Design a binder for these strands. Structure first.
Lengths: 119, 121, 89, 43
RNA sequence: AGCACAGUCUUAACGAUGGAUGUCUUGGUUCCUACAGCGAUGAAGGCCGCAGCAAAAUGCGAUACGCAAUGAAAAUUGCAGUGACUGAAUCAUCAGAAUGCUGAAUGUAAACUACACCAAUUCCCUGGGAAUAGUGGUACUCCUACAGAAA
RNA sequence: ACAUCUCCCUAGUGCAGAUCUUGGUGGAAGUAGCAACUAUUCAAAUGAGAACUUUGAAGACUGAAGUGGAGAAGGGUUUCUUGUCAACUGUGAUUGAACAAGAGUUAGCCGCUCCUAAGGGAUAGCUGAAAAGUGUUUAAAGGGGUCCCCGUCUCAAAAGGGAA
RNA sequence: AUACUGACGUGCAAAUCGUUCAUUUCAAUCACGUUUAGGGGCGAAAGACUAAUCGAAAAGCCUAUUAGCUGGUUAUUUUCGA
RNA sequence: UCUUAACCCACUCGUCUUGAAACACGGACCAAGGAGUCUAGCAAAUGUGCAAGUGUAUAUGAUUCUUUAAACAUUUUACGCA
RNA sequence: UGUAGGAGACCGAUAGCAAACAAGUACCGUGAGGGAAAGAUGAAAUAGUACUCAGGAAUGAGCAAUUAAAUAGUACCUGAAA
RNA sequence: GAUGUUAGGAGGGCAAAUCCGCCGAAUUUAAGCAUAUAAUUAAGCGGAAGAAAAGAAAAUAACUAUGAUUCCUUUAGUAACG
């Protein structure tokens, strides 16, 4: 059975070749299961999961390569882009929300809320 | 108790005991440790492993010592070699023992268990 | 009339006028007027009303899978960990 | 009737598939069964 | 080996019959504290699937009752497989995955797995070689920007 | 698991009855009853057991507006083979449309699928707080030719029309 | 569906069965598709019909509507008592 | 104690009703559930505390912070009623 | 109201959320909709009724046999009344 | 003002306890009933938030005056309406 860390080393051509080989064996197992004559059927669980593990690693690596390709500036794919509440996505920035008028800023500069004690 | 966040209701505590995850069950498969070993490590209690050696202190089989056969974490039974019982048809299985009915002598010590023993010390 | 009221009536009751409804699923799609009675369809709005409490509750959110609401729970506490992983060994 | 479309066909095969009794290998570690004349599907 | 009228009624003993009472209780209940929106980045709802042996709930989505990662961490068994001197077997966490068909549902549709049109498209290998009719895009209203048309 | 009469607070606190509510159960009673549609018999086989399963021999009936063939609606594995007898099959029962296990429906040419009708839903508009009511009714929207010419859309017949 | 006010009337049946009778090439019958929905429809008109439901359907809610009227209204002893 | 006897007495209970043993009504039988309550505002009575006052309201305070969701206190001169 | 807690001089399976359970399910209604019944063996079934005899087969019985206990035998606690 | 599958974007829908907008009744009460009442409530169609809404004087007073909003205690069952 496969080990995730070992799979991450592999070349994409080779990793897909391994996956296809596993698929052919799994297909053979399904044919044996269907035939039903002295089946080794319990092996199917292991193989389906090995294929699953292979697919996750390939998809993670491919996704990371696409992410590296779209590393900088605007216009990353929106599937790839941040998932957070629609309301948060819609609103003006906290940065902008915090920012305020020149007359107000001068007022702020005029009246700081100092700390104090009583004699 | 003096903490007012954690419940002291009977109902919830029972529910937690019955619907326990496997790690929680493993925690409450603890046994008291044998008296010289207890003195040696200053450790009251250890979680049993499958290959350990217990002495039975309760039930009709009290005062029998022996190696632990199998643990059933789920329904809270350990099985010990010399508490065999024949079934209704005469076939032999092991009597299940609650983990608080036994005192642990020889612990099998792996790397992880050794690290836990180091934590206790 | 032998094919008259009661027993004579029930005998002629072939031919369904309601079917499943793709959106609603409750068998509430009236075929002839092309309209689902409860939960609407083909209306964009979901047709419902407040007089039956029973009807309101037995089609509540949490009747089904809640694929994304369920996923969002736990995620809300975690939040700060966005886009990340526990660090390598 | 004889005539049908894919959704009805699939559902009827599903209902047939469902109806079969509980397996006895599970049991050694209830049932709702439909009889066609007595209880109609109501589709 | 004899003796008992039968039935009806009543009584006691001993039972059938029935599920009351009592005893429980991983449930309700109300109040109080606390946080508190999801959605075209495609929700809720609904279907259709998915277990080696698998029907119904639960769980999950063609990678389908677990994947990766972490923390626990040696068992797991109904049968049968599997694993251990620590990224496997078991749990919990779960921040990275995936994410069926739909459904506002948005290509035109709808007791349809019906039907358009425009892009042909995907993968491997470091600038080249292989695959597949497959995969996308195309709703309505609006806004900011641009375009060549008009008066 | 149980009490408190030592004292006292608190209550969803005392049943024969409501044609009470809910659940069980009698007497009525081995009784009412198992009354449409001409008739079954003999011998055998099966099986623990046969008036009502199977086979054969007789006798008969339905009498082509059929208990016959095909089909629609509707039902939905009821089909079919192999088992089979707990319940059901208002009598019996080895029977079975019951129950368990499997198997079974293959289309260029047969239908749907295409077209329009009686019709339905929308666009353009316009009304209506909105919900909705309408449907060319103050249109700068779809198709064909080589800049011109046509010109609301869409669903609606499994017995109309229709390619084999 | 005229009559036998036949059989039935704890049904075979919430209108059946028998016998009788009327209708049969047209103001014909039947299907399928279609239209109009509750003080609303539809009515060769009977207050008919509108899913066993009709001189105002069915569903849910306002609602635990209201009632000089009906029924019921639970342990004991003792006292005064209409 | 139970059990027949025999003598004497003994009319279906509940019910509304002038009058029920009624030819008045409800009751086949048994079990369990099943009906003058709670809040608001008012009154008299009685208990209880204080008195020309009374009631700490809202609220603040604390070595109050398993119990404590009440108990305690009223600034190192509001309001009801009289 | 949703989720997460902590609670209780609350209810204790005909009660209490319709729902202690494979319940907003079964089932019923053309449909809008309506909407249940339904908990308890034992300490341990990794103690679940072995074996024998008579039985076509159900089953019964045992000088046989589990358990402390089977008139505890899985529609299993206690087991009232009719 | 058109046209654009032009480039970047948005709205749509669901859920509803508390919140806000419209639209908007009757049972009921008066021992009847028509005004009043129920009630600016129930249903209906819409919009939001973790709270919203309201909010910085076209305010109250007639005092020795106060001085955005909300909320509690209160005025007060009072002025008043019928």
């Amino acid at each position: 059975n496969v080990k995730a860390y070992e799979l991450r080393t592999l070349k994409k051509k080779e990793l897909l070749d391994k996956l296809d080989e596993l698929k052919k064996e799994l297909s053979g197992l399904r044919i044996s299961k269907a035939l039903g004559n002295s089946a080794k059927n319990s092996k199917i669980h292991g193989v389906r999961k090995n294929v699953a593990r292979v697919l996750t690693v390939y998809n993670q690596k491919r996704k990371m390569e696409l992410r590296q390709l779209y590393k900088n500036k605007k216009f990353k794919p929106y599937n790839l882009r941040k998932k957070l509440t629609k309301n948060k996505r819609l609103q003006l920035s906290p940065k902008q929300k915090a920012a305020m008028t020149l007359r107000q800023k001068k007022k702020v500069q005029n009246f700081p809320q100092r700390k104090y004690l009583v004699v | 108790k003096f903490n007012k966040q954690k419940s002291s209701s009977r109902r919830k505590m029972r529910k937690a005991h019955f619907t326990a995850p496997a790690g929680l069950r493993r925690k409450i498969m603890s046994s008291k440790l044998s008296k010289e070993l207890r003195l040696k490590y200053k450790t009251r209690s250890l979680p049993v492993r499958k290959d350990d050696e217990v002495l039975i202190c309760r039930g009709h089989n009290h005062g029998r010592e022996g190696k632990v056969v199998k643990i059933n974490r789920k329904r809270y039974k350990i099985y010990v070699e010399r508490v065999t019982r024949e079934k209704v048809n005469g076939e032999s299985t092991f009597i299940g023992i609650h983990p608080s009915n036994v005192v642990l002598t020889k612990l099998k010590v792996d790397k992880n268990r050794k690290k836990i023993l180091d934590r206790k010390a | 009339g032998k094919a008259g009221k009661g027993t004579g009536s029930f005998g002629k009751r072939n031919g369904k006028t309601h079917f499943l409804c793709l959106r609603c699923g409750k068998r509430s799609y009236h075929l002839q007027k092309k309209k689902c009675a409860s939960c609407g369809y083909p209306s964009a709005k979901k047709r419902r009303f407040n007089w039956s409490v029973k009807a309101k509750r037995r089609n509540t959110t949490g009747t089904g899978r809640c694929r994304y609401i369920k996923t969002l729970r736990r995620k809300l506490k975690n939040k700060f960990t966005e886009g990340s992983t526990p660090k390598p060994k | 009737g004889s005539i049908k479309r894919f959704r009805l066909k699939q559902r009827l095969g599903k209902c047939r598939r469902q109806n079969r009794p509980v397996p006895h290998w599970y049991r050694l570690k209830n049932t709702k069964r439909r009889h066609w004349r007595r209880t109609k599907l109501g589709l």
